[PDB]
Amino acid sequence: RILTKPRSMTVYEGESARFSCDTDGEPVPTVTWLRKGQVLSTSARHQVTTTKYKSTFEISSVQASDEGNYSVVVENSEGKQEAEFTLTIQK
Known part of the structure; x- marks a missing residue:
């Protein structure tokens, strides 16, 4: 959860x-x-x-096609949820 x-x-x-x-x-x-x-x-x-x-989400060698605003939808055998944040990159 x-x-x-x-x-x-x-x-x-x-x-x-x-x-x-x-x-x-x-x-x-x-x-x-x-x-x-x-x-x-x-x-x-x-x-x-x-x-x-x-x-865990790691960002490496991120080119100009990934942007930040990244979220994570996590469910379960009988559940459902999600999160959100933003990891941009000044290429």
Whole structure:
């Protein structure tokens, strides 16, 4: 149920940008990073990565086609939620 949401910021390009949230489930919930960025989930220049009870979205080598405003829709065997933030990049 969204134990904790990630933060936000504005990086330059492949500088840092690190995100990490937490979510309960039954058992183990599911996450869906997405924000006009191809559901993030490591789809090109991103570096997402979920874990047992906590996920993490990392942005590296981000070109001029990722922008920040990134959210995370996390569901569960019998639940549904989401979060949102924004990690831009001054290419």
